[PDB]
Paper text:
The assembled complex was further validated in gel filtration assay, and the results confirmed the extensive interactions between [name] and [name]. We subjected the assembled complex to single-particle reconstruction cryo-EM study and determined a 2.8 Å resolution structure of the [name]-[name] complex. The overall structure shows a [name] hexamer (open-ring state, comprising six protomers A-F) interacting with six [name] proteins in each of its protomers. The architecture of [name] is identical to previously reported open-ring state [name] structures, in which the midpoints of protomers A and F at either end of the ring are offset by 45 Å and leaves a 12 Å wide gap. [name] binds extensively to [name] by attaching its N-terminal α-helix to the N-terminal of [name]. The negative-charged residues Asn9, Asp11, Asp14 from [name] N-terminal α-helix form hydrogen bonds and salt bridges with Lys115, Lys105, Ser82, Gln85, Ser84 in [name], respectively. In addition, residues Cys10 and Tyr13 stabilize the interface via van der Waals interactions with residues Leu114, Phe 89. The [name]’s β3-β4 loops (residues 45–50) make additional interactions with two [name] protomers. As showed in Fig. 1d, the residues Arg46, Lys47, Asn48, and Glu50 from β3-β4 loops make contacts with both protomer D and C by forming strong hydrogen bonds with residues Gly22, Glu19, Glu125, and Arg88, respectively. It appears that the open-ring gap between protomer F and A is causing a disruption in the interactions between [name]’s β3-β4 loops and [name]. As a result, the density of [name] in protomer F is considerably worse and has lower local resolution compared to the other protomers of [name].
The [name] factor is a ring-shaped ATP-dependent hexameric helicase that is conserved throughout the bacterial kingdom. [name] plays an indispensable function in transcriptional termination and gene regulation in bacteria. [name] ([name]-off, also called [name]) is the only [name] host factor that directly interacts with [name] and inhibits the [name]-dependent transcription termination. [name] binds to the open-ring [name] hexamer and inhibits the initiation of [name]-dependent termination.
Author numbering:
A (entry chain c): 4 to 32, 37 to 81
B (entry chain C), C (entry chain D): 1 to 280, 284 to 417
D (entry chain d): 3 to 81
Write the structure that this text describes.
C-alpha cells in the first residue's frame, strides 16, 4: 500500500523541514515539524509536537497549509 | 500528448500541427524550439503530458533528462530533475526514467518531473536493490555469437570468412586494424545486419565519433537499433560527453542481467579528443595521462558470472602518416583478446573481404567450439599457412562459393 | 568484530548483514563503503574490533595499514597510524601489524590504532632487535628446489623437462625469455603448483603488473598462496606503488630467517611504468635514469649466510614490434644466474612445453646436484647437442613418457 | 612486575602534555596525589618512564603506575 505523493508535494514539504518551520494539521476531523525519513519502503514525517514525536504518514495526509505556503496534496 | 511521438515526427507535419493550434509562423526556428512552443501552448489538460529520457547529473547537484534521437544534445526541451528526487530514488547517471511532467510555473526555463512511473523498465522500489558494476566478477567467453546465415548469398561470404577466421562470444574485447580505403564500413554494416538477424534478444549500440553527415544518415537508415553520432563540426567535449553517456547507459543495462553489444569506430579519435580536453610528460605529441580515460572505456568489456554480458568491438586506424596514430596504436596493443587485420594489397586488386588470414585469431577458442569443429579448423589452417595473402583470399572465396552453412564445405575436403 | 573476516565475505552476505542491523540503502555502493558503514554502526561496545595490516609510511610522517585482499589499494577503511607510535615501536614500511582499533573521534576521518599485539608474527620487543637486510652477506645457492612430483601425469612432463634443463636453487635470479603466444602463462602456473605441493614451508607470492581483468580472477582461483595485481586501466603511479609494497614486505620476512619466492610476470612492463613517472637521456625512448629503480628490485635476490633466502623469477618480452622492448631486454642481459628460452617455431607445431634446450642453462650447476646426476646430465647434453630444436623436443617428449621418474629414464638410457 | 604497557590513545595525549611544560596531578596509583610538572618521557631495558621537574627535583615515574593526569585540557583517565 502507501500510495506515493507527487514530487512537487514532496519538494516544498522537504523545503519546509529546513529552518524548523511549523505546519497546520492536528485532528483528522500550530505544529512544529522536525524531519522526514523512510523505513521498509515507507516515508514518514517526524514532528516535535511539544516533545511528542508523532510519525505522520504521507499516504494518510488530509491537507497542509501555512501563512506563506498553501498546497493540497493530491 | 507524448514527447517521444513528438520528437519522432517530420518537421513538415510538425509545422502544420502547430498551425492548427493558433500558433504563428514556426517555420524559421529550430526543431526543439518548435517542440517547446507546441508543448507550452498545449498546457490546459491536467494530464496526458508524458515524457521519458536518460539521466545526466551535473556537478552542482541537479540533473537533466536527455533524448537519444538528438544524440543527447542539450537544448530547450530537456526535463529538469531536482536533487531531492535524486536523494529520494537513489538515482544515478545513465538511468532511463519515464513518467509525467509539468509546465514551468514562473521564473523557470524548463519543464519539470511530476511523477515517476518506471526506472530502467522496472518498478521504482525494485530498481534500488541491484549490485554495482565494479562489484561483479569477470569470466571468459564461454558462449558464442554465430554470424553466418543460411541463405546462399554474396553478402554471406564476408560473414562466413569472419566465422572461419575469428569466432566471437559474449563478453569479447575485439580489435580491427584497418588501413585507409580497405572496406571497413561495409564490414561494420555486415556485422550489424548479422547480429540483428541472428540474435534479436540482445541490445545493439552503434557509436560514431568524428564522421561526416552523409555517413551518419546512411548508418541511421540502415541499422536496426540505436545509432548515436557526432560530426567533425562539433568540439571535443561533445565527443567526450557522447562516449560517457553511452558507456554509462550500457553499464546500467548490464546491471539488470542483460546482454549489450557496442560497435565503436576509431577509438583513435576518441583518444585524440581526450588528449585535446585533458589538462596538461610528452611521448611524441600525446600526454601520458591523456590515455587513462579511453582505456577505462575499453576495459569495461567482460562476462559476468551472475548473468549478463558487455561486448565491445572497436576499430583502430594505421598507416595514416601521423605519429599520434602510431603512438596510440602501440599503447593499445595487447589489451584485447580478438584481432582482425585488413590489408591494402588485397583491396587494390578488388577482392571483396580483404582479410589477412594468417594474422587473425582469438584467444581461448577451445571454449567457443566443439572438438570436431576445432579439428576441422586446425586442418584448414594447416593448408593456408604456406600461401600468400591474395592467393589465400582467392582460394577461400573460390572454395566457399560452392556450398553453404560452413559444414558442406568441410565435407568437400574429405 | 574482525576486519579480515569482513573483507572475505561476498557483498551479497554483507548487504544482508547490514540490513539485519537497521541500516538504510547500501546496495548501490562499493565494498569498502559498506564495510565502513557496518563498522561504524557496530561501534557501541568498547574493546571489540580487531585488525591487521601492512604499514606504508607516507612522506608527511604518518602511516596507514593496508590489506592484501584489495592489492593494497587506498580506501576509506584503512587504519591510521600516528608518528608517535612509529617512534615508539621503531616501525618501517612493509611491517605487518595486528592489534586493536577504535572508532574515529569527531573531526577525524579514519579508524585508528588502539593496542599493538603482534609485529611480524612476533612480540613487539622481540622485533625491536633484528639486523637490517643490507647488512647481511650473499653467496651462491646450495639447497635445490625440485619440481618433479613423480605422479605419472601429463602435467609432470613440463616439470621433468624443467628439472633436466635448468635446475633452480634457493636464492636464484632467473630470467625467462618468451616470444608472443608460446604458452608462457601455462608454464608459470605449472611452477606454482610444484612449489606449493613439494615445499610447503616457503612463502609464495605472485605479482602481475599490466594483466587483463579476466586473467586475474583465473590465477586467483588456482594458486595456493598470495596473488597481487593491477589491470591496464589504471595509472602508471599505481603500477609502481604495488611493486614497492611487495619487495619491502619480502625483506622484512628474510630478517626472521625465512625463505620467500616471488614470481614476477613481465619485468618489461614494470620498466615501462618507471619511464612514465621519473623526471626527464631517452635512449630509444627510455630515459637512462628510468632503469635504476627496476634494477634495484631484481638485484635483491640472494642467499643469506646468517639464514634465510630470496628467489626471483621474472619474464622478459621479446619480438613484439616495439623498439622500447628491445632496448630494455639488452640492458638486463647478463645480470641473472639462470636462463630459460622459449621457441615460437615449436609452439606453431602444437608441441609443448617448447623449451629451446640448446640455449638454456644455469651457472654453478655442480653445487646444486650430486656427481652421478651431473655425469648423467652431461651425457644427455652431449647426446642432444647435434639435433635440431623441434627434433630434440620431440625426442625428449617421446623418451620421457616411458618411465615415472627421471632416475628410471637415466637407467633406461644405459 | 613485568611492566604491562599502556594504550596508544593515552600515550599520544600524554606526549602532548610533555610539550609546553603543562602541570597535571599524576603522582601514584595507591593514594598519593598532589601536583607535578611532566617534562619528557624515555625508555630503558623495555621499560618506559616520565621525567618531570617538580620543584626542581626530577624523579622517574613509570607509565604502568599513573592513574590520572588531571590538567585543565587533558583531565580524565583510568590508566
Amino acid at each position: 500500500t502507501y500510495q506515493p505523493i507527487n514530487c512537487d508535494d514532496y519538494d516544498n514539504l522537504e523545503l519546509a523541514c529546513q529552518h524548523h518551520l511549523m505546519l497546520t494539521l492536528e485532528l483528522k476531523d500550530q505544529a512544529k515539524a522536525s524531519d522526514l525519513v523512510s523505513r521498509k519502503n515507507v516515508e514518514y514525517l517526524v514532528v516535535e509536537a511539544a516533545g511528542e514525536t508523532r510519525e505522520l504518514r504521507l499516504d494518510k495526509i488530509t491537507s497542509f497549509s501555512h501563512p506563506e505556503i498553501g498546497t493540497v496534496v493530491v | 500528448m507524448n514527447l517521444t511521438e513528438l520528437k519522432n515526427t517530420p518537421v513538415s507535419e510538425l509545422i502544420t500541427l502547430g498551425e492548427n493550434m493558433g500558433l504563428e509562423n514556426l517555420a524559421r526556428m529550430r526543431k526543439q524550439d518548435i517542440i517547446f512552443a507546441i508543448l507550452k501552448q498545449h498546457a490546459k489538460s491536467g494530464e496526458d503530458i508524458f515524457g521519458d529520457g536518460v539521466l545526466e547529473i551535473l556537478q552542482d547537484g541537479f540533473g537533466f533528462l536527455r533524448s537519444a534521437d538528438s544524440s543527447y544534445l542539450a537544448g530547450p526541451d530537456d526535463i529538469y530533475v531536482s536533487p531531492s528526487q535524486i536523494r529520494r530514488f537513489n538515482l544515478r547517471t545513465g538511468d532511463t526514467i519515464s513518467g509525467k511532467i509539468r509546465p514551468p510555473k514562473e521564473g523557470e526555463r524548463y519543464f519539470a518531473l511530476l511523477k515517476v512511473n518506471e526506472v530502467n523498465f522496472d518498478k521504482p522500489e525494485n530498481a534500488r536493490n541491484k549490485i554495482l558494476f565494479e562489484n561483479l566478477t569477470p569470466l571468459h567467453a564461454n558462449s558464442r555469437l554465430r554470424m553466418e546465415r543460411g541463405n546462399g548469398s554474396t553478402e554471406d561470404l564476408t560473414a562466413r570468412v569472419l566465422d572461419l577466421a575469428s569466432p566471437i562470444g559474449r563478453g569479447q574485447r575485439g580489435l580491427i586494424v584497418a588501413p585507409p580505403k580497405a572496406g571497413k564500413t561495409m564490414l561494420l554494416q555486415n556485422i550489424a545486419q548479422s547480429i540483428a538477424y541472428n540474435h534479436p534478444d540482445c541490445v545493439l549500440m552503434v557509436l560514431l565519433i568524428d564522421e561526416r553527415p552523409e555517413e551518419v544518415t546512411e548508418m541511421q537508415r540502415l541499422v536496426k537499433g540505436e545509432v548515436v553520432a557526432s560530426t567533425f563540426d562539433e568540439p571535443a567535449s561533445r565527443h567526450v560527453q557522447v562516449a560517457e553517456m553511452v558507456i554509462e547507459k550500457a553499464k546500467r543495462l548490464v546491471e539488470h542481467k542483460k546482454d549489450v553489444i557496442i560497435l565503436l569506430d576509431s577509438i583513435t579519435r576518441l583518444a585524440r579528443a581526450y588528449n585535446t580536453v585533458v589538462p596538461a610528460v610528452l611521448t611524441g605529441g600525446v600526454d601520458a595521462n591523456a590515455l587513462h580515460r579511453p582505456k577505462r572505456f575499453f576495459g569495461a568489456a567482460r562476462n559476468v558470472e551472475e548473468g549478463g554480458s558487455l561486448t565491445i568491438i572497436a576499430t583502430a586506424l594505421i598507416d595514416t602518416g601521423s605519429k599520434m596514430d602510431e603512438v596510440i596504436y602501440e599503447e593499445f596493443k595487447g589489451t584485447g583478446n580478438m584481432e582482425l587485420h585488413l590489408s591494402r594489397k588485397i583491396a587494390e586488386k578488388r577482392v571483396f573481404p580483404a582479410i589477412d588470414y594468417n594474422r587473425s585469431g582469438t584467444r581461448k577458442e577451445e571454449l567457443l567450439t566443439t572438438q570436431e569443429e576445432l579439428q576441422k579448423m586446425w586442418i584448414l589452417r594447416k593448408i593456408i599457412h604456406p600461401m600468400g595473402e591474395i592467393d589465400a583470399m582467392e582460394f577461400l572465396i573460390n572454395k566457399l562459393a560452392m556450398t553453404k552453412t560452413n559444414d558442406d564445405f568441410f565435407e568437400m575436403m574429405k
